[model samples]
Target: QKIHVGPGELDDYYGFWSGGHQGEVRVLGVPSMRELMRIPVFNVDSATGWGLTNESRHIMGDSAKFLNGDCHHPHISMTDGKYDGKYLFINDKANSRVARIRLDIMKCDKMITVPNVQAIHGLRLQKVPHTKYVFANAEFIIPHPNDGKVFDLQDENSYTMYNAIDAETMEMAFQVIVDGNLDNTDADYTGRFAAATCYNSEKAFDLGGMMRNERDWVVVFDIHAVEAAVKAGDFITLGDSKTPVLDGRKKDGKDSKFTRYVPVPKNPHGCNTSSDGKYFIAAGKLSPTCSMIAIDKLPDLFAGKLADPRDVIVGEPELGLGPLHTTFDGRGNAYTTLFIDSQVVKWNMEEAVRAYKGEKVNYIKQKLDVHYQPGHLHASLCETNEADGKWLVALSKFSKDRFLPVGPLHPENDQLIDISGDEMKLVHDGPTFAEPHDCIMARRDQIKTKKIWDRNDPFFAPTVEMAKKDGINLDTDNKVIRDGNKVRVYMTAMAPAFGVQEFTVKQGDEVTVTITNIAQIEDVSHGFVVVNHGVSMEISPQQTSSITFVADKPGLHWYYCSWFCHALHMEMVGRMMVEPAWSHPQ
Candidate 1:
């Protein structure tokens, strides 16, 4: 079966009214190329709209205040039970607010204000099965004020809050801000800061500290006092503890020498706990990797108490740089999205332990292969099935090209690239994708769709039948032929250990090649592309796609997956060798 979806090229990212712009949410169904639903927030004409609160009205003034317009980008979205049924909560990085849209009601209800929270990125809602408190991670930092006073921005000074929202009313019930600088030796200054939070115990939550400035620590918060403060309407009372519950910096402390910080090669971004709560995975944004922390085995340092915060059960590198978001399947596997590289990576937790612990680990790395470009904003593990085990869906905010400075050569100055049906190819260059701001994967059960295309039929039978009935031989297969004396070869998947592939032909021989997808599984999509050769096509499972290209050029050529498979898709790719008019062994 096709193990992954994407590198599939389609007209999904084009058109003026199309929903391929940045900050739009797109969800894919099985079979591929079929979009279940897309949240088109960009086209909302606010010239005349109502039911907006003063805060939202002020934020939405003249469309200039829109989060996408502010260049903040939509980072993450998740379903939080509220506003009738399932509510889609989106992080507005530019506006510094959590925007909520009641999917059931199909209306924007509220936008929780969190001012000065620039880069207000990753977010997750946490509430016990039968609890009133809903905790969330506001893992971000405000830019250092430009007052010109020397300050340690790297210190673990910042903190994250665990807000207890009234489940029934969906209102802010209480807020518990967990500061990390409480027990620092330099009490006058805030220490390393908190980036992400996860539940470690009923009354405690694990906090991820930036290890760059101070030692890396996952401190626990005693919520008794903070909870009281929240109840009393004093949310600011939530600060670091004056005393250390478990000092991770002291050798004699829990885990002793091991209590020091874990050196995350790059700054960590998103962090989450496994469904079973036995492990934690932290996304290293700049490190290009994810650190798997074991929570079950507490070191001797934490013999009777929460171990020194810095002591983490270090494991292998899960994903590459800009590993922004992560979520785990019911199984041990974890799914991560690389923001810098614009790919999704799946880590088999069973094998991940071996690799991270420096043991012999047999793990396969699968990349989405296609470049969603501009990198991804977040990724979530949707579901687990016998066919794929675990599936990961990702969202890309913008293309890297969009961020490039404008000049004479690059004239397209629009920050967001709108995808129309015919112009979708403009966003399909290898390693270049339109700005796909947000994406999510609905569970198969939730979707109730098994395949994007029926395999029991002839390949392109529906399209071909439609075209034939229309009396037009678009010659879908004609695209697969070689036009000149040279035969152009395209490699979809590449492996470092293996070399490459080539296509050979005579001076005037016509070349016809068929690209069949050997791997066919429900929910998985695959495709191929020849860079700069004007050849690209997406082949569904059991379907064969063809594309014609002129071998006019005698130089070496490269082809890669044009769809958004994971990063491994790119690495899983290969190259094509084209012979010259007079070829001979050197």
Candidate 2:
């Protein structure tokens, strides 16, 4: 009864998988180091001649067929019911559709394509016992920009809403448009109905609305009522007070419409209600914190107002990074994946009450060890088992080993921190994993291997001479020099050539590197990193940056360009050799 956790990728057939980078899924059996599966979803092809006759065609030609195109951003959500005794549902990011695949059938039966949904974003299925209506949330509403023609910008009307559909017919039953002006936007409906919403306008955009002024908000709608209205072909005002009823019914002069708004944290990305529909949780994408609101007493907290919001710091040991997406078991435990910090964090909401009463609450922690540069985690969950207890599942988008240091890089080093297995305890940290975005746990009966894939290749390596020509000077007369007990290495981006160089330093010596990006290219940043030696720093263009560290360990370390550009980074890679000073012969 052990639980297994795995990661998924977005390949050609699927369109795009979201998260850190592009790679296949990796499955790990609970309470063990053994890998269970490594499935390949993408592949490369060679050129073949195209002709009318089979004998006259060339064996291999100049052009080739791409069987498996790149799968970029992917988001997935599991359902509660069994499709022929197997769990089903996978929301593909690339195709912008919800796929219903029966594990027993071993194939997908139906795919409800989202008309113009470029990035499906995130998804969740709501099922009420004995009910036929199914509800799902499609986070962002803006269509994906497949071409370079469209600008990547946010508008006040750029809303991500949820919809209710007939699972049997695959027809849209109802629609809930998240009004950008509303505050509280989280909601849930059991056999009856439940809803919640939040707003935090401060951190809505990168320039803080200095570029395009707009407020952030979340809104929840009654599915049954909205569905009836849509079927009636009536006009409904999405986010405004003058919103008309859609069911073709005349508005009563005194029929107080239900709408509530409250100020929440900044950049709210995800929201979810407890299985019992008692607790409501919402997480901020850009904010370093997450919050939990008590739905039962929410109205009282807001002084009889419909909405009230509060923040909850996910205090689970391992460094709290960006708490992105979360899913809750029937109990009070929550499993959340962080994007910026590059790790999956488990938080105990039950312990929060004890902390409020001045009692110490135990928190469990674990490391997913995937670099996930810029950590854009879309979805994650915890699976419970009778034997091994619990495991996690997550999703990742951009799968690239090499990326510009100026933005976000994958978290490839797990030896930097200590983690625990069953409980979030600090065990130890050593050489571990790189950027991983998302993962999941399927049914125990599905005896299939989980596939693990990476985007690392020898062709991506930079030549040593090319590194030197990129601007690194290894000679004694260079601006960077080795002194009595300290070494100074100077770096600048002015050199037009791109590449890396290698140099030797003595053990037990302190070395200092001052990097100055003389190039004044806007939006370009560089990094001076001594791989495996723990010396890394980013240098902004035209800005001088310095770092000091002791070279106590003896070994050969590699350094390379941290920025991403056409040929600049490809030519900017180098290394350093550290030897004992006493070993030098006079």
Candidate 3:
């Protein structure tokens, strides 16, 4: 069946979405719903061979990063806290780094690893409205090196912190350790100030854990004052982590009162603010309806002017099942996604505004049904983020039979719903990739994409740029050299081929290999992974990368190019035979 395409007059915008486990970010225009491009971040992509370029391989496994990146939340550059159409930011939960993607050339110019955190919230990456400051929160507390020793970050024992990245360079500005047995932080918002919603307030120990996590809380901070707290030495640094932890339970206590806390009911999945900044919206995953908190009175609450903590709440009425994330129309309404119910609830904020005027009003609105379990949804200019509200995409986690005959593994269905008028209408069933945790959008004609950083630049991947002059000579350099029990294999990766030595080694033999891929040609890119030898590395065009593993067991291991390039990608294979016993003497 033909779906309703946006009538050009409105659907002229672009939506940027996380490729999830695919380790890429996709760009699609509104209304037309065209998949224009994909920016590969963590993993290798034959389409562009992102990790296959000589200037690109340094983005992978280099600098203590893993071979994969599961991205979520694509945040566009902001000027005056609105999309400037300049830079795009995407966080890789798999490797704990956020990439600064230059929209111009649509390439990842920089990959910044959040210092001292094993994983991010894995969702909801955002910019600190109107500033070059991009904010990231670690999912939970982990050991400094994250090496498995259970380091307790109780009240004084905190493991995770907030990471601030310079939007231009994609470099870490600073990391501020937070107090709480931090289970997780999600769906943040910033305008007049910065705000975030989280749960598990009462249970303090397991936030850095796989244990019981259940409580509800919302935290707000004076963005500027939060800076002073750190600079002025108002907090405690844990061990050698340099992470600041604070607990200002008392308003005038020793702790810097820069950040404020408000307790919500159970679990709140979404947090957003009105365009006018008069109020904010929150959706509880456990509660039936969403909650509205008056920010105008929030500072007063933070100042401890109120006797009760619930005074900041305007409305907490039920909307639907498992309210997750909430977005808005430029109009007087707010749209919330109900995960368990598989639908969206569109409600007017007129009463909310009146309530903000101190005139009591209920904040309840209408709800619409969607396909399967919907996680989050986006409108033209949705969060502190996406616009005309001509279209809204309902991101469903599960879509059964919406499309045809794909196996058990299928792209999540992101249904494009038309909200041009009052009633919600379904238009197209667009399949977005691999469990995308979140998304964002902008008008195409309103913005431009370009290459901000050039190759041979210092900020460019260090290894790749350094090889710019004395380029890789893979053909003549490929060889297996031996030194005592240590063997070094030099190889080349070119398209659907790998110039590697298929040699035999004994048990406990130390094997180290370095492979450079042929660049200069755009189509020359490849990936290397051994069948069961625990080896994985990508060779970008004209880029050299390495891998090392001891031949521990007596089994033959088959290695091949992991990237699917050309039609004969399966034909590119090599073997390394590990003998049953050690034959070569030291």
User: What are the root-mean-square deviations of the candidates from the true structure over C-alphas?
Assistant: 22.3, 21.0, 6.5
lDDT, candidate 3, 1-586, per-residue tens: 2244544443467888888878788888776677877777776764444564444555543732355777767777766546777778777776778887777667776787676776665333344445467767666656654555656544343356666676766666556555442322332344335556665454344435422344465666555665667677876654465545444333343334655666665556666665545556767777776667777776686676877656777766567788887777777788888888788888777675465567766655667888788887788776444456677888898778887868987678888888878888888888766887677878777577432223333423444433333353444466776766777677766666667748777778888666767545664567777777666765556555666678888878888888777789888888898877645554
Q: Which portions of model 1 show Cα errors greater than 4 Å?
A: 1-85, 115-119, 130-170, 176-225, 228-265, 295-307, 318-322, 327-331, 338-344, 355-358, 364-368, 372-374, 377-391, 396-434, 444-586
Question: What are the per-residue Cα lDDT tens digits for candidate 1 across 63-153?
Answer: 4355351112222222221111244444444444444544432333454544222334444443222223333334443222423453343
In terms of TM-score, the best-performing candidate is: 3
> All candidates' lDDT scores?
0.39, 0.41, 0.65
Q: Judged by lDDT against the true structure, how good is candidate 3?
A: 0.65
Q: Rank the candidates by lDDT, best first.
A: 3, 2, 1
Q: Which ten residues in a row have the lowest lDDT in candidate 1?
A: 183-192
Which is the leading candidate under lDDT?
A: 3
**lDDT score of residue 308 within candidate 2:** 33
The CA root-mean-square deviation of candidate 2, after full C-alpha superposition on the true structure, stands at: 21.0
Q: For model 1, what is the alpha-carbon lDDT of residue 540?
A: 44
Error of 3 at 361 (Å): 6.1
